[PDB]
């Protein structure tokens, strides 16, 4: 990614923010991938809630990553509110993915990414 | 829109929810349009914060409308948290658009739509 | 929606474009709803491809509607290319939803909306 | 990112695809960042078209990256069409960012990322 490079060249120009942006896109892609993999499983009926939570997590992580890419200045912003929402979403998604992690390696990877994004988003709210 | 029609045919099948979904997409489109119109104004330098807030509002309204389109059942969901975030975003965007409404009719229309979406999102959290 | 009202107040200021924008958001919401309803069906395993195509259609319709909301001027734009892609996507999604329409009323509604969006997007490329 | 790891664990389980997905998210974030930086410049009026093209590029790159994250199987997909559209979008955005690269380092970085994403998307269509 180019998050760090672009922040430094912004005319209104932060490690916690760079890490949060990176993780939001990483998590958005991973959740999209996890939902699609759950949809291909023989036992797809067992994974309905996990697919649904992945879909919401991918939507909220993209939104958060976009908002946070525009949060390099000092002006009022929705950033902290959005990051709290992303954190809560990632917490929910992680718990459900974690529950299937013994059965589906893709859900283990997704749960780990959601946990990391949750942590990153919380850290950026400081 | 087909929000009402699709909710009723959902196998896990609410006026406040239908109104919120409709308004989130209406507001997403209106904010996207408002940012683009502000970008075309002679006095674009005066509208920087308004463009930025429109961009964040369009992102959050789409996300909210998507999440709420999947919230027709009884299972745990990020819905209330997301709708509070949308409400707060629309409040911010409305205030800035409102400030330019005497000068730019497109900002008057956008402020009115943001106010309505804010109200709809708050009502759906009940 | 406020598409027509916002186009007329744009400083660079078209019926086919207003109809396309409206339909793209209508279709994005309807496909999101259809995927979520398919995920709740007893026979979810039979609907894997339909869910997947709905997810791609909702993503592409939002993108198209956003791009087209910014296409009110005369400058070079990705608009025609994006609308052709939306048309092709809606065609694919319609065919799969249509196949399940006798079994699931939500897929009948979605197929009808996808057909209309396809038509609208093609008309706006003129 | 976790693109490579998730592809390998997909029940329907490609270097060109992993590179395209990674680049689409990298480019989406970079274009979002570039538009926000152009909005903060003293000479924002000179950057209107660049901001607009960045906004469309961020929208199309996210959509492409999402679609391509679900393209790990053999079934019919919009993937090739979407990747051609992303390529064309990145080409347009690159040319405009490149034009400002002598004046704004953020536009130099964005033009380089758009060029790479364009190349990656074209390579994945093979
Ligand atoms: Cu997750
Ligand atoms: Cu999850
Ligand atoms: Cu997950
Ligand atoms: Cu995850
Ligand atoms: Cu607004
Ligand atoms: Cu606003
Ligand atoms: Cu506005
Ligand atoms: Cu507005
Ligand atoms: Cu469809
Ligand atoms: Cu469909
Ligand atoms: Cu459908
Ligand atoms: Cu449909
Ligand atoms: Cu670009
Ligand atoms: Cu560009
Ligand atoms: Cu750029
Ligand atoms: Cu770029
Ligand atoms: Na900002
Ligand atoms: Na739901
Ligand atoms: Na335009
Ligand atoms: Na697929």
Numbering used by the authors:
A (entry chain A), B (entry chain A), C (entry chain A), D (entry chain A): 1 to 13, 18 to 130
What do the authors report?
The ability of bacteria to maintain appreciable amounts of intracellular copper has only recently been discovered. This is achieved by a family of copper storage proteins (the Csps), which are tetramers of four‐helix bundles possessing Cys‐lined cavities binding up to approximately 20 CuI ions per monomer. The twin‐arginine translocated Csps (MtCsp1 and MtCsp2) from the methanotroph Methylosinus trichosporium OB3b are involved in copper storage for the main methane‐oxidizing enzyme. This organism also possesses a Csp3 (MtCsp3), homologues of which are much more widespread and allow bacteria to accumulate cytosolic copper. MtCsp1 has 13 Cys residues and binds a similar number of CuI ions, whereas MtCsp3 has 18 Cys residues and accommodates 19 CuI ions. Thiolate‐coordinated CuI clusters are remarkably rare in biological systems, but the crystallization of MtCsp3 in the presence of increasing amounts of CuI provides unprecedented insight into how such species form in a protein and are used to drive copper storage.
The crystal structure of MtCsp3 plus ca. 2 molar equiv of CuI (see Supporting Information6, 7, 13, 14, 15) has four partially occupied sites. These are Cu11 with an occupancy of 0.25, and Cu12, Cu13, and Cu14, all with occupancies of 0.35, which form a symmetrical tetranuclear cluster. Cu12 and Cu14 are bound by the Cys residues of CXXXC motifs, that is, from the same α‐helix, whilst Cu11 and Cu13 are ligated by Cys residues on different helices (Cu13 is also weakly coordinated by Asn 58). The thiolates of Cys 97, Cys 101, Cys 114, and Cys 118 bridge between two CuI ions (μ2‐S‐Cys). Additional stabilization is provided by CuI–CuI interactions (ca. 2.6–2.7 Å) between neighboring metal ions. There is no preference for CuI binding at a particular tetranuclear cluster apart from in the structure plus ca. 2 equiv, in which only Cu11–Cu14 is occupied. This must be due to the fact that as CuI ions diffuse past Cu15 to Cu19 at the mouth of the bundle, Cu11–Cu14 are the first sites they encounter at which they can form a tetranuclear cluster. We identify [Cu4(μ2‐S‐Cys)4] as an intermediate for the three clusters that are made up of the first sites (Cu3 to Cu14) to be occupied in MtCsp3.
